[PDB]
Design a binder for these strands. Structure first.
Ligand SMILES: [Mg+2]
Ligand SMILES: [Mg+2]
Ligand SMILES: [Mg+2]
Ligand SMILES: [Mg+2]
Ligand SMILES: [Mg+2]
Ligand SMILES: [Mg+2]
Ligand SMILES: [Mg+2]
Ligand SMILES: [Mg+2]
Ligand SMILES: [Mg+2]
Ligand SMILES: [Mg+2]
Ligand SMILES: [Mg+2]
Ligand SMILES: [Mg+2]
Ligand SMILES: [Mg+2]
Ligand SMILES: [Mg+2]
Ligand SMILES: [Mg+2]
Ligand SMILES: [Mg+2]
Ligand SMILES: [Mg+2]
Ligand SMILES: [Mg+2]
Ligand SMILES: [Mg+2]
Ligand SMILES: [Mg+2]
Ligand SMILES: [Mg+2]
Ligand SMILES: [Mg+2]
Ligand SMILES: [Mg+2]
Ligand SMILES: [Mg+2]
Ligand SMILES: [Mg+2]
Ligand SMILES: [Mg+2]
Ligand SMILES: [Mg+2]
Ligand SMILES: [Mg+2]
Ligand SMILES: [Mg+2]
Ligand SMILES: [Mg+2]
Ligand SMILES: [Mg+2]
Ligand SMILES: [Mg+2]
Ligand SMILES: [Mg+2]
Ligand SMILES: [Mg+2]
Ligand SMILES: [Mg+2]
Ligand SMILES: [Mg+2]
Ligand SMILES: [Mg+2]
Ligand SMILES: [Mg+2]
Ligand SMILES: [Mg+2]
Ligand SMILES: [Mg+2]
Ligand SMILES: [Mg+2]
Ligand SMILES: [Mg+2]
Ligand SMILES: [Mg+2]
Ligand SMILES: [Mg+2]
Ligand SMILES: [Mg+2]
Ligand SMILES: [Mg+2]
Ligand SMILES: [Mg+2]
Ligand SMILES: [Mg+2]
Ligand SMILES: [Mg+2]
Ligand SMILES: [Mg+2]
Ligand SMILES: [Mg+2]
Ligand SMILES: [Mg+2]
Ligand SMILES: [Mg+2]
Ligand SMILES: [Mg+2]
Ligand SMILES: [Zn+2]
Lengths: 150, 208, 138, 234
RNA sequence: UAGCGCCGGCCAACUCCGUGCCAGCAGCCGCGGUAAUACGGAGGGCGCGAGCGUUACCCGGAUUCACUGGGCGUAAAGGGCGUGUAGGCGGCCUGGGGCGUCCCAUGUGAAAGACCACGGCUCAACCGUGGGGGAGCGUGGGAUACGCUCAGGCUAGACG
RNA sequence: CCUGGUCCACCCGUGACGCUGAGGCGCGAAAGCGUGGGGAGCAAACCGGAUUAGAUACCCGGGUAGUCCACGCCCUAAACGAUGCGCGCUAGGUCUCUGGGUCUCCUGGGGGCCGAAGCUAACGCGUUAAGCGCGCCGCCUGGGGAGUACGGCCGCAAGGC
């Protein structure tokens, strides 16, 4: 099991001749607060259907973030097209100082103290995809000296 | 200032029995064991989904209204704690538990922090010889929070320390019921503390 | 005219490590050679030699990629992830030992030409000098 | 005894239609044809075959994918002889990532083989007989060999990665180590174990795959003589 | 002595009644047309509390003047194009200078504030002492990679 | 006839002479204007014929200025590859224009298409970059007001900046 926190739920509408059919989108993250997050983005015509589908994709697609002291190894300024997010690691005992979108991604990675800024466009989908790209780009001292020791 | 009065209402509304009344909140009529749902005409309805601001505000209220601190006194304590060099929450909690009314509560001269507030405000408690009439009086590590002579034979302090004959004060504290004093040894931490407060959400409340 | 030769050479390094070239043939100078000597000291690259085409001395840097990763897009992650000429010609930056940057918490480094030779930022903060902060490599 | 035969027809293919990341192995260019070097070919054959001899007797299953006219029945013959599943006909969309769904099609194949040997010829009338026969043949055609071992694979043998870009992307998505025979019209980046060499000469397919299947039969124990393409050829 | 704001979202806290595109609300989105959680009242709640609100002004959010830190095909943005003055920028090896740069001890960087300890007012606000930065800028010495310039050379730029 | 640009080859000479460039100066379609000339077609305006409710329009007949020449001004444009210039790097395939070669190729310059990585809001661009860079220049900072007004400068004026 994981903590299963949803970020945004949105109800997107395609046009049929007649009404306009909806499709509830739902961006959950799953996290054990150990260093594993998953970003699932389910699109279902019903809402608990959307939360179940998104949790299914999120548990299916995980990423191990290599934490240290409950925070992050290095400063990382990643981008997802127009949405760019910086993460500056903190001295511990500072709090997850982040937006409402990546605060849950970091807090379900189980960081404690991280200093971010949702730059660029702050769209809750793109920022979460950028944050998964950040925590998949995150490297520590051991697994960079392993790539330099040759 | 003291906010006032109704406090098992705040034993409710955050879902944890943060003890404010005292022996009432220990006795089987807390009206938090009886009714765990928050006060209000709605109250026992579906939980409105607690927002990201809502969870930080509720748990910052769990940190505040335990100690009864007025918010700007709390916030100035926080903006002293952030400048104070240390793990920020785990120096903030020690600063909160180093107030004189809270040290008198932890020392058990009173069943509640508001009774301890009346004790220190009405001039009963002495710190290092002379009486100190301040609930916000910080206690430096290594000083003797005592009871003066006009309140040593008080029935309230007598019954309170009667209750505290054999009770367990903290490892950052001491106790002496034969002289009704106690050395505040060091500052406590969250590992020392029985707080129903994730301190980190209170830390995250103030970078709003 | 390779208006910055160092910012030409580091982007030759970057444009070849992106396409996973085995080796670059950058042009030759003593400053570029000491910069690549710093990079091979730190362990980003597999050195350099002295090649020639039609009377043009070079440096052939041999790059150092990683293991073939699993999952889709299995290209090896590159030890020269980011590389950036900081003190450009249009803006020459210089710092002292008080303003030496820890380049992303000491994973990457900062090549800086100091007065006591070209140094890494560890060597700059160890010898005391600052200088022209040439390029952050991380 | 290997390259003595691999130099037969089994090397030298597509002219001027080449994925240039394959240029490690590409040797020369004569008559337009990009002839492929045989030394690095045979050492890469050993790099594949070491992994096949490991993960073939470790309970691991190989999934033989081949869709072209050149490599259909010489995949179908040599694929069934080690228990290994195959796709002779058009390999569908997501047999691997959607495997838990195409398991329902395998079970409809099983519960239609129940209806073959059934008393539902007498009842279950002729207009449902033609419907379930058109279901059974159109399911047993494109899902024939993908039935043998009822789990996700442990490696796949793609016989052409550019025709099977649908397949190599799926197995790289599912961490299945692709081994694939590829001529100059493919890239080896998303191929975990490459057989460099031709793909459309019938000997080029069948002889490489027959040596591979002799290695997997010997990895199971008890080696028997391989399958013939030297029966109706030429 | 306890009040003031707020309860549609942003923003924590929701029901009833009266109103019926009216009366009104508003910071934006917008509510109001007869079931209004958006208006008026009551209940209840939330926030703060001898204060709470509003206004104006400023900074932040505003990476929305982008040095750190933006762009220019179509979104706002390539000058109609060339030649070219000022400018800005400048290939490679060598040598001095030490002008930029960097370093070192000082000289100043007043006090007050800011910061850190430690103290006095019952604590705190304040206030006292001590200590440390403190950009700069002068002075003296050193460093010479890079930027500089003078001298020497080269041929990968450019021209013939 | 006069003359510019550019490319190849040889690697012959110079020895960094380079690149960009605010203001300048020059060129700058088409329309327009001036002074003459020329006027066959076409053709704004204009006149008619239908058309249509109306038709100042499409359609048709006519028809001037203009289109044309020379000199001289104007100086805007969807002056567009809506992509400033130069240089360096980063898979390729294509036919295609030119250049060389003891030439079923291979190298140089130019004009497109399909595409690697990368980019991008996407469309798509993709060694002729909208990739990676560096230098320099111009420009943008919500739309409308408004490219208007005022002033200045230029122009014969329209009008431009
Ligand atoms: Mg679907
Ligand atoms: Mg971006
Ligand atoms: Mg924005
Ligand atoms: Mg916005
Ligand atoms: Mg009471
Ligand atoms: Mg802050
Ligand atoms: Mg700069
Ligand atoms: Mg709420
Ligand atoms: Mg009315
Ligand atoms: Mg109101
Ligand atoms: Mg009514
Ligand atoms: Mg009503
Ligand atoms: Mg109301
Ligand atoms: Mg502002
Ligand atoms: Mg700003
Ligand atoms: Mg800038
Ligand atoms: Mg536009
Ligand atoms: Mg535009
Ligand atoms: Mg323009
Ligand atoms: Mg203009
Ligand atoms: Mg242009
Ligand atoms: Mg020029
Ligand atoms: Mg000049
Ligand atoms: Mg100097
Ligand atoms: Mg001094
Ligand atoms: Mg001072
Ligand atoms: Mg005192
Ligand atoms: Mg003081
Ligand atoms: Mg002082
Ligand atoms: Mg300075
Ligand atoms: Mg000519
Ligand atoms: Mg020569
Ligand atoms: Mg010279
Ligand atoms: Mg004209
Ligand atoms: Mg005129
Ligand atoms: Mg005229
Ligand atoms: Mg006519
Ligand atoms: Mg007419
Ligand atoms: Mg008419
Ligand atoms: Mg006409
Ligand atoms: Mg006229
Ligand atoms: Mg013109
Ligand atoms: Mg005009
Ligand atoms: Mg054009
Ligand atoms: Mg044009
Ligand atoms: Mg320009
Ligand atoms: Mg070309
Ligand atoms: Mg994309
Ligand atoms: Mg293209
Ligand atoms: Mg190329
Ligand atoms: Mg405006
Ligand atoms: Mg005017
Ligand atoms: Mg005039
Ligand atoms: Mg102009
Ligand atoms: Zn209670």
């Amino acid at each position: 099991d994981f903590e299963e926190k949803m970020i945004l739920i949105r109800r997107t509408a395609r046009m049929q001749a007649g009404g306009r059919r909806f499709r509830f989108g739902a961006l959950v993250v799953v996290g054990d607060r150990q260093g594993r997050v998953g970003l699932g983005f389910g699109k279902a015509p019903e809402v608990p259907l959307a939360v179940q589908k998104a949790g299914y994709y999120a548990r299916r697609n995980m990423v191990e973030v290599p934490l240290q002291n409950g925070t992050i190894p290095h400063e990382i300024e990643v981008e997802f097209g127009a949405s760019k997010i910086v993460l500056k690691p903190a001295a511990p005992g500072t709090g997850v100082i982040a937006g409402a979108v990546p605060r849950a991604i970091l807090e379900l990675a189980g960081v404690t103290d991280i200093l971010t800024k949702e730059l660029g466009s702050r769209n809750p989908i793109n920022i979460a995809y950028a944050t998964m790209e950040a925590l998949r780009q995150l490297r520590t001292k051991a697994d960079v000296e392993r790539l330099r020791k040759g | 200032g003291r906010y006032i009065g109704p406090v098992c209402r705040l034993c409710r509304r955050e879902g944890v029995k943060l003890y404010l009344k005292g022996e009432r909140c220990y006795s089987p009529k807390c009206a938090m064991e009886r009714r765990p749902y928050p006060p209000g005409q709605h109250g026992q309805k579906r939980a409105r989904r607690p927002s990201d601001y809502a969870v930080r505000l509720r748990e910052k209220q769990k940190l505040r209204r335990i100690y009864g601190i007025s918010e700007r006194q709390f916030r100035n304590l926080f903006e002293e704690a952030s400048k104070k060099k240390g793990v920020t929450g785990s120096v903030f909690l020690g600063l909160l538990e180093s107030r004189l009314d809270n040290v008198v509560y932890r020392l058990g001269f009173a069943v509640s922090r508001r009774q301890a507030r009346q004790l220190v405000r009405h001039g009963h408690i002495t710190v290092n010889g002379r009486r100190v009439d301040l609930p916000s009086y910080r206690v430096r590590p290594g000083d003797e929070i005592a009871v003066a002579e006009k309140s040593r034979n008080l029935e309230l302090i007598r019954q309170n320390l009667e209750a505290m004959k054999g009770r367990k004060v903290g490892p950052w504290l001491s106790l002496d019921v034969e002289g009704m004093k106690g050395k505040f040894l060091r500052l406590p931490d969250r590992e020392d503390l029985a707080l129903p407060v994730n301190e980190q959400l209170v830390i995250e409340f103030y970078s709003r | 005219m390779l208006t910055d030769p160092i910012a030409d050479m580091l982007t030759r390094i970057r444009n070849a490590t992106r396409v996973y070239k085995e080796s670059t043939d950058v042009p030759a100078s003593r400053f570029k050679e000491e910069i690549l000597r710093i990079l091979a000291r730190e362990g980003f690259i597999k050195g350099y030699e002295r090649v020639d085409v039609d009377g043009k001395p070079y440096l052939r840097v041999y790059l150092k990629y990683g293991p073939r990763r699993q999952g889709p897009d299995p290209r090896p992650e590159q030890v020269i992830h980011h590389i950036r000429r900081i003190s450009k010609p249009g803006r020459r930056v210089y710092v002292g030992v008080k303003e030496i940057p820890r380049v992303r918490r000491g994973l990457g480094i900062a090549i800086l030409s100091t007065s006591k030779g070209v140094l890494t930022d560890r060597e700059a903060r160890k010898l005391g000098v600052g200088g022209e902060l040439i390029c952050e490599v991380w | 005894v290997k390259e003595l035969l691999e130099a037969g027809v089994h090397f030298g293919h597509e002219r001027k239609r080449w994925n240039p990341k394959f240029a490690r192995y590409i040797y020369a260019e004569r008559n337009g044809i990009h002839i492929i070097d045989l030394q690095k070919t045979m050492e890469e054959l050993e790099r594949t075959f070491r992994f096949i001899e490991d993960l073939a007797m470790r309970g691991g299953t190989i999934l033989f994918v081949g869709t072209k006219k050149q490599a259909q029945d010489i995949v179908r013959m040599e694929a069934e002889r080690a228990g290994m599943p195959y796709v002779n006909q058009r390999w569908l969309g997501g047999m691997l990532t959607n495997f838990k769904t195409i398991s329902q099609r395998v079970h409809r194949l099983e519960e239609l083989e129940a209806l073959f040997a059934s008393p539902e010829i007498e009842e279950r009338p002729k207009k449902e007989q033609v419907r379930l026969k058109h279901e059974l043949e159109r399911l047993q055609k494109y899902l024939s060999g993908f039935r043998l071992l009822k789990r996700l694979p442990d490696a796949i043998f793609v016989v052409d990665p550019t025709k099977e870009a649908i397949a190599v992307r799926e197995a790289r998505k599912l961490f299945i180590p692709v081994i694939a025979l590829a001529d100059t019209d493919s890239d080896p980046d998303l191929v975990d174990y490459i057989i460099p060499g031709n793909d459309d000469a019938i000997r080029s397919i069948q002889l490489i795959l027959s040596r591979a299947v002799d290695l997997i039969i010997q990895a199971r124990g008890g080696v028997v003589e391989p399958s013939p393409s030297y029966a109706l050829v030429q």
